[PDB]
Every structure is written in structure tokens, then in C-alpha cells.
Nucleic acid binder design. Structure first.
Lengths: 352, 256, 254, 254
DNA sequence: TTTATTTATTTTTTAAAAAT
DNA sequence: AAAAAATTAAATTTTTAAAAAATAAATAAA
DNA sequence: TTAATTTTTT
């Protein structure tokens, strides 16, 4: 939720980004922000405008997509923890009001495009319309409960609890292309984790330790940098983008010096809103306790999974049976550890 | 400007036939002290530490410690152009962009120049300490190749039990059970077909079989396999080639 | 308890290489007089009578007349583990439901113990007695193997005929037709390569060459094969092994 | 009326394994002066000219000119029935469409009669001006098999260049550049392993390597390959069949 | 036996269709 | 020129099969 | 959630 952070780390700190392979993370416990993945499947997997839906009336495109993505997530050996969002905070209410206003404008343009008759405009304006309800996340948590793959309900935000599970070492990394995990404090962030045979995108792995080594900052100055160049929690100062926020952080550290020394006659602080509440909410959120979780990848239920997905979602039998067989093969293969648990990485050889 | 005329090109052809199935994309750490390759598996659970020292090559010459990354499938397909006795001559030019491979047959004069395109890699090299292993097992290499090749039909994992009597390879699967148990050769007629055990303490570890098959793809390099292992420490499958270097092989155990 | 040492373990290895392609699962009958297998094909057209008697076994011990169910592909893979010079010790512990296979190397270094997971399978044995067969031929098995590999390209049908002169391997199909004439010879100096033919009636019988190719896959067992046949009785492809036993291959004509 | 006793029976096996994958159907134009086969490719790029004179056959009885169409996959799987030492007799008749092949063996008493049905096809006949080519080499056939088999892994194009030092093969592709230089032989006096170059001017042409992989299936026919080419004519790959015939392969430049 | 050579099930490969 | 903000602008993955590449499983004279 | 690109601006 940081406007222009991945391009910034691609610009000024190239040593953080290691675009690795999806095969590379064998046996890595991984926390995953799941709600954006649910919108990725409910936006992407459509049969020509219509979402992939069944006889009873509900949609099952997210169930389809994350069953298939999680089976080839274990087929590369990545062990996921799909972390689900909870109650959003009162500081996120302005951005959620902006999202609701953009959804209302998309609804008005969809009502224009339905009378217009262009099919691509209707499918794009319903591709910017997707919003879940707790019934959708309950169906997904029923899938992950029958998966034998652990779900965790975050209290406030899923990426904050993902960053806490990386910080306690309960998982190796947080997997989302949302960039808030480096703000909330995660050392390793896994962008673009797509478990596909069409391996069009490498796994963009973001290291916070190389960011803090390269930029020479602690956690607090990086949180102030992300607040200055734009977050989904509080408004940024108008006129300061990525590079001048990097220079303003690097010339004096805290945001209090930034708001107390910079003149309002050129770059004014908008609305005189206090950024310190967003700072303390990035550092200390209502976060999940990482020592009280049960990160156990058990044996999957097969017959109850078939009964669920073909008694109230009416899927096809042989693809789920091949998926559960690949899941059983991966559960037999998942006891193999890495060499990184025994031999430490002492650099990376780069060719010319 | 790198140049290394290797008079026994079957050794380097067997190195790339070994490394082709295990690593798809690898980076060669070529220095003045010798030729090194340290790259893991794509699943990052099986490391190869190739060493080809400068004394094994005839005319070794390297100015700067140039690191380059090749496609091992493409380099294996280009080293299959050389014969069994073809003298493989390495050449990398100063400010390297391609690798030239010259294959000279000894009897028939034939210069098989093979220029090969280089490519860019980011390969994590790892600091392996010089530790001493408890279970160190010397085997004939075809015997260990046979053991991995026929226990791969049984299951997905071999429990390598190490005793003072001999090393025991146990694999269990849905087809059945298997227990290949060896003995230390008290009566030794030949060195290359003898099993020596160098115990400090008995260990019992489980290793996967796909990477073990990729290790036993290095069988025609040397006739000896130095199976070095300890408790919850990765297994060393050392293929010490004749006075030119040593091809290590690392594998993380299936921990329980 | 069943225990059966077997020094020439290559013989049992090519028995399982012979029965890998035909039979997936059969009941390996164990008797005091040897191991028997009166199996029957998965395509249900041909009968297999494997008999390895107990005098050619080096150390044979059998208490109960048990018939365990053996997956032949699994025992073919486990005997593909076994080397060509390995002393094979078959074992079967009572109340275990496991056929244990122990391979001993010629040197006293490598011991290869394997086991199986059997199944509760039973078969209805038919039983064909050995009556006075009219037409018996005995050619070398590599030559008959070459004959079936010759005629399998032309079509999936062989017309094996006999006369006073010699055996005729007629075949026909979409590629043309091919007649292979193999005559008898009066050569008693060589036995594993010369052919003797005893004939009573001039008979023409039509078979299928897919199952005859599967019987052709048994020829490394011996250099002596036997095609005994008559007018209406289905033929055998008898594989004359030495003192351990034999291997019969019954096949109904088309 | 046609009979052709070929006594060294590996020759026709090597011809049919040479021309099996390249030509699917052609016309064996058989005359009284010897068996000829002049045919274009099935993909219609490469010309194949096969000519065996009558002095190599032991009993070549040809009454008149026979121009009949023979399926090369059919005749290649018929010659796969033959052994590597037998005697191949091509009995034929123009009344029926039967090309009978009889395989008398010296080692055995095998008579393998093989009558083949023949299809009616339009007999292609394209002449070649028998010119003195520019670069005519005489280089080993296993070396050409090795060179085409290894340069085909780089790309589908070889730049065959002749010079005073010798022939140069150069293939470029996705894996890189591969240059193979074959020099002379000074004082070995071997003249089968030896490479001799007969050149008036140096040339440089680009040839496809898939068709050269098809052309190197004739490498057990001879130990020498006579590549003769000029700047505009196709490359002529000639295999000297046992000093009793020749197989010429033509390939247009790329 | 040992070393390579074909056949041919086995796999990826892009690029197509539907996936419910 | 360098750098921000307005305004869109994109979120997936089976199976199927056309086309091409690799092995071990036979296949077997050399 | 993140980009891509024209427009606008220090």
C-alpha cells in the first residue's frame, strides 16, 4: 500500500531485490496475505466476463484459484500460511472511503457500459468492482481447514501479522505484492508469488536488511520514508515523491524535523494531520501473537474435501483427485530440509 | 584472458554430464588457483562443489578471477561434440562475452573450435567449513551408482545407516521394503573395489533419492565415492578425480 | 516358514523379466517339490506354467503349501535390483504377509535384503495335462526369437506349419506376407543350435504375434525352445531350463 | 523374370536403413545394366540417386527394364528381418505385384521368403550433368556422421568451406558458434582414414543439417564420403558401396 | 561385457481451448 | 531536465496437443 | 493491492 516503493527499491537499493525462482524456496514456511489473493482470483479467473460460479448462486473462483495455486505451491515445496484480514483500523477509513467512492464510480460507469453494450468495458468495470464478504473468507477458510494447511486470522491487518511472523521467525517470509510488509517490519518480502507452469514472472524477493544497510536507516526512518512518499494509512505531503523523501530522510532522520523545518510556502503539509499515529500504528499495530499459533501442515482431508467441493460447489472430480494426490506426494517430500539450515550463505556470486 | 588446455577432455565431459542433470544454470568461479564451481540445486537442497585445480590442467592461465555463468545443458551439448580422447582447450577472452572451446584429437589433426554464448547469473555461493565427519565411507563408485539406481525403484528416500560392520542403505516404499547392507572389506584384493569405514560414532540419517541419482550420475569420473556424513549434518558425496581436483556433492537430510 | 537359496540368481531374474510383460499379479504356489506358477494372462488368452522344482534349488525349505499373491512388476523391479551373479535367498516368514528376497554377492561384502507388500489374491487354476503331443519341434530359442521379431513387423498373425521337411513360419498382413522356412537337420554334434523335428500330422495353426512376442521375451533363459502342438490342442512354448525346472507358455490359436 | 543374388547381405540392410527415414515411397528403376534408384525427397528438397552395377550381384538375371514402386518403410522393415551375413535374392515378376525376397543364410538353414505388395507410382527421372565439381573431398564417413551429429545440436545450418589446409564446417545457432577444421594427412599412407582434398577454387555454401543427418544414415555402407560441390550446384554426398555401387545424395544450398 | 543406437514412452514447450 | 500527480490499467490456471527434446529400455552387431 | 503514460511542475 505504498505508492512507489518497489520502483524506489529498484532505483536506489538494487541489492535488496533478488528475483529468485519459485523452486528456490523448498520447505520454507511462508506467511501469505490472503485477501489480495482472493481479489486476484475473483478478478482474473472469469469465463468471459462472468465469474466462475455454480448452481446455488455463489461464486467459487477464489476457491478454484487458491486450490490450484496452493497445490503447485506445495509442488514447488513452499509451505504457505494464508493469513486473513480482520477489522481494519480507523486510520484506514479514509482510504477505504476512497476505495468505496472509486467502486461507486466504477458502478456508475458499469451502468453506463451495460447500456452501451461493449463487452470488454463491462468485464473491466466489473473487474474493478470485486469486494468480499465474510461468507467468501469463510468458504476460503473452510478450504484451508480441509487442506491441512494453516490459516491465521489477523486482528487488524494481515500484512502486519505477516511481518510479525517473519520477525519472530515462525515463517521465513511474507508473500504478497503489497509493499506494506517492509513498513510493518518484515525482513523478507516475497512479491509476485504465482504458482504457475507459465512462469512468466520471477519471485521478487525484497530484503529489508539490505535496504537498511544501503540507505543507512533504522525501522523508524523507513516508516517515515514510506509515510512521506505515500501510504494507504495517512496522506502524504503534496509535492514530495520518492526521491525527495529519500533525500529528506537522509538529511535529517525523524519526520518531526521534516514537519518543523520545511517551509509551508512551497510544499505545504496538507490538512495539518498528525503522521505520528500512522507511525505508531506501523511500528506497534494490533497484531497477532506469533508464539500462540499452530503452524502445522497436516495430512489433508480427501473425502470431506470431495464432498464439499462437489456437493455444494459442484466441481470436477479428477482434477481435485490429482490435486490431493500431488498434495500427498508433496507431504511425503516435505520432510527434506534445506542447506541454508546447516550452511550459512556467505555471499552470492554474480557474473559479468 | 583465460586459457586452460586440458589434455584429458573426457574428465571435463564427465563433469558436465554429471552436473547437467543436477544443475541447469551454474556459475563458474574460475580463478588463478584453479577452476571452481559452487552452485546448489534449483530446489536449493543439493549443492555441488566442483574443484579443478591448476596443477591438473597442462597450460593453465588466468589473469583476473573471472566469474561467468553458462547453461550446463548447452555446455553439455557442446562438450558432447568432443571425443573420448579429445584435448579440450578452454579459452575466455579478456572482457569476456563468450567462451571458446577447442577440441583437438591427438592422432587425427582436427581443430573443433566451439564458441559458446555466456549469460548472466546470480548464484549464491556458500561457506562450507572444513569439518571432520564421523561416518566416512569409501565405496566403489559403480556399487553406489547401482545402490542409488535400484533403491530409487523402491521409494523416495534412503535411510543411510552407518555401522562399524558396514554402511546400510534402507529404503521403504509402496512397492515394498529394501535394505542394502554392506560390509567393510577385511580381505582387500583391489583398492578400487573395496569398502573402508572410518567410524567415530554411529549415525542414522535419511536422504532423498532424486538428488542421490543426480550424484551417481558422476560415476565414470572416479571409481571411488567418499560418502562422508555425520548426525544432522549434510552428506558429502565426494568424487575425487585423478590428481586434478575433487567433485563434492552436498545433500540436506530429510529431518524428522 | 519358507526359505529357498538359489545360487544362479540370473535364472529367476530372467523368469521375472519374462513374466513382467504378461502377468501383473499371480499366485506363486510354493510346494515341497518346488515353486510352481500356473498363471494365466491379464488379456485372458494364454496360460503360463512356470515350474522351478526344488532339486535345482541349493537349499530349499518348505513347510506349508502356501500360495502368496505376488505383484510380478514389483518382483521384476526387485529382481532388477539383483545382479546377474547374485546368490538369491527367497524367504517367507509365517504370519507376515511378505515375500522376503535376500541377495548375496559372490564376495562376502554386499547383502541386499528386500521385502514385498502382498495382496489377498486368488486365481482359478484350469490344468492342462501333458498327453501324447503329435508335432514337436525344437529349435534354438534365439533363432525362434529372431523369427518372431521378423514376423511381428508384417502382421499380428503367424501361421506355423510343419511337414516332413521342416517347420514353416508363415505370416501375412498389410505389409505383404512372409514365409520363414526352417528345415530339420541331422546334426548330433551340436544340440543347442541344431533342430530336431518329430511330426505326426501336417497341421496349419493361426496364432497372434503379440503374445508370441511376450513369449519371445523369455529366450535369454535357455538356448533351447520347444513348440509342441497338434490340430486342436493349444500349443506350448516350452523353455527347457536345466535341473532347476522349466517354463511352459500355453497359447490358444486364433 | 528378375533375380538378384546379393551375397553380402548387410549391403541392402544398410541401404534401407539409409533411405528409410528420408524417402517414404519411390520407384526402384531396375534395368539390365544394374539396379538403379533415382528419387526425390518426400519433403521434396533432397535428390537421392542410387545405382548398383551388375558385377556386385552374384546372380543378376534381369530380362527387361522393371520400373515398379516400392514402399521404403515396408522394404526397410523387410530388410530388418534379414541377418547381417545372409544372401538376399530379389525374385520378381511383372504379372503380379510381388517383390519376393528370399534370405538364404550361410550360418544356418534359414529360408526367409518375403513377398511384398507394390504400389503404382509415377517414375521420377531427373538428370544430373556429370561435371567436374569445385571442392571434391574424400573424408571418413564416421567423421561426417560425427560432424553432422554434433553440429546439428547448435543449429540447422552448416557453412561448409574448403581451403588449402582443408575443409571447414561451421554451424551457428542459439548455443553459439561451432567451427570444425579437418586438415590433411602428411605421411600415414592409409587412404581410408586419410583425408584428401581435390580443389580448384575455394567455395563457401550454407547447407541444412537435418538433411545431412538423414544423409549420414549411410555411414556403415562405406568408410569414405566424397562430398563434391561448387558455388551453384547442389552438394553431392557419395557413398561408395563396396566398390560395386554408389549412393549419391544431393542437397540444395540454404 | 561394454559402449553407444535406435525405438518410443516420457516429459517440457508455446499456444490454444475451457475451468463452473 | 527532473520529478509528481492525474487517469486509467492490469491482477489465474488448469487440460489439451502441436511441436520438439531427452532417457532408459531394449536391441545388438562390433 | 501495483503499474504505465501523458500531463504538469519545481
Amino acid at each position: 500500500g505504498i505508492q512507489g516503493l518497489a520502483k524506489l527499491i529498484a532505483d536506489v537499493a538494487p541489492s535488496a531485490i533478488r528475483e529468485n525462482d519459485i523452486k528456490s524456496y523448498f520447505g520454507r514456511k511462508v506467511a501469505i496475505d490472503a485477501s489480495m489473493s482472493i481479489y486476484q482470483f475473483l478478478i482474473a479467473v472469469r469465463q468471459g466476463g462472468d465469474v466462475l460460479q455454480n448452481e446455488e448462486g455463489e461464486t467459487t473462483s477464489h476457491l478454484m484459484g487458491m486450490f490450484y495455486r496452493t497445490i503447485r505451491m506445495m509442488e514447488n515445496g513452499i509451505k504457505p500460511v494464508y493469513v486473513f484480514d480482520g477489522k481494519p483500523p480507523q486510520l484506514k477509513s479514509g482510504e477505504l472511503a476512497k476505495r468505496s467512492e472509486r467502486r461507486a464510480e466504477a458502478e456508475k460507469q458499469l451502468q453506463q457500459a451495460q447500456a452501451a453494450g461493449a463487452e470488454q468495458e463491462v468485464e473491466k468495470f466489473t473487474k474493478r468492482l470485486v469486494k468480499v464478504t465474510k461468507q467468501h473468507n469463510d468458504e476460503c477458510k473452510h478450504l484451508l481447514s480441509l487442506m491441512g494447511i494453516p490459516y491465521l486470522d489477523a486482528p487488524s491487518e494481515a500484512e502486519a501479522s505477516c511481518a510479525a511472523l517473519v520477525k519472530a521467525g515462525k515463517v521465513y517470509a511474507a508473500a504478497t505484492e503489497d509493499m506494506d510488509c517492509l513498513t510493518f517490519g518484515s525482513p523478507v518480502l516475497m512479491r509476485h508469488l504465482t504458482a504457475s507452469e507459465a512462469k512468466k514472472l520471477p519471485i521478487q524477493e525484497f530484503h529489508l536488511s539490505r535496504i537498511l544497510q544501503e540507505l543507512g536507516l533504522n525501522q523508524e526512518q523507513f516508516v517515515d520514508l514510506c509515510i512521506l512518499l505515500g501510504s494507504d494509512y495517512c496522506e502524504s505531503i503534496r509535492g514530495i515523491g520518492p526521491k525527495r523523501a529519500v533525500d529528506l530522510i537522509q538529511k535529517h532522520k525523524s519526520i518531526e524535523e521534516i514537519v518543523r523545518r520545511l517551509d509551508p510556502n512551497k510544499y505545504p503539509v496538507p490538512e495539518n494531520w498528525l503522521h505520528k499515529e500512522a507511525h505508531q500504528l506501523f511500528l506497534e499495530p494490533e497484531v497477532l501473537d506469533p508464539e500462540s499459533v499452530e503452524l502445522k501442515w497436516s495430512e489433508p482431508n480427501e473425502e470431506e474435501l470431495i464432498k464439499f467441493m462437489c456437493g455444494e460447489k459442484q466441481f470436477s472430480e479428477e482434477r481435485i483427485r490429482s490435486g490431493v494426490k500431488r498434495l500427498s506426494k508433496s507431504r511425503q517430500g516435505s520432510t527434506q530440509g534445506r542447506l541454508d539450515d546447516f550452511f550459512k550463505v556467505t555471499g552470492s556470486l554474480s557474473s559479468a | 584472458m583465460f586459457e586452460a588446455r586440458l589434455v584429458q577432455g573426457s574428465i571435463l565431459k564427465k563433469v558436465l554430464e554429471a552436473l547437467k542433470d543436477l544443475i541447469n544454470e551454474a556459475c563458474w568461479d574460475i580463478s588463478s588457483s584453479g577452476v571452481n564451481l559452487q552452485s546448489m540445486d534449483s530446489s536449493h537442497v543439493s549443492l555441488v562443489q566442483l574443484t579443478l585445480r591448476s596443477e591438473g590442467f597442462d597450460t593453465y592461465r588466468c589473469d583476473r578471477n573471472l566469474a561467468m555463468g553458462v547453461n550446463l545443458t548447452s555446455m553439455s551439448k557442446i562438450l558432447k561434440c568432443a571425443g573420448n580422447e579429445d584435448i579440450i582447450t578452454l579459452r575466455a577472452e579478456d572482457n569476456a562475452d563468450t567462451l571458446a572451446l577447442v577440441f583437438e584429437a591427438p592422432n587425427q589433426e582436427k581443430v573443433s573450435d566451439y564458441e559458446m554464448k555466456l549469460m548472466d547469473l546470480d548464484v549464491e555461493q556458500l561457506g562450507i567449513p572444513e569439518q571432520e565427519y564421523s561416518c566416512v565411507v569409501k565405496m566403489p563408485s559403480g556399487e553406489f551408482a547401482r545402490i542409488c539406481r535400484d533403491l530409487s525403484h523402491i521409494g523416495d528416500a534412503v535411510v543411510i545407516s552407518c555401522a562399524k560392520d558396514g554402511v546400510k542403505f534402507s529404503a521403504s516404499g509402496e512397492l515394498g521394503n529394501g535394505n542394502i547392507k554392506l560390509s567393510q572389506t577385511s580381505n582387500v584384493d583391489k583398492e578400487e573395489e573395496a569398502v573402508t569405514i572410518e567410524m567415530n560414532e554411529p549415525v542414522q540419517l535419511t536422504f532423498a533419492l532424486r538428488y542421490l541419482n543426480f550424484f551417481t550420475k558422476a560415476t565414470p569420473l572416479s571409481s571411488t565415492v567418499t560418502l562422508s556424513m555425520s548426525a544432522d549434518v549434510p552428506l558429502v558425496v565426494e568424487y575425487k578425480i585423478a590428481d586434478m581436483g575433487h567433485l563434492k556433492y552436498y545433500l540436506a537430510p530429510k529431518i524428522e
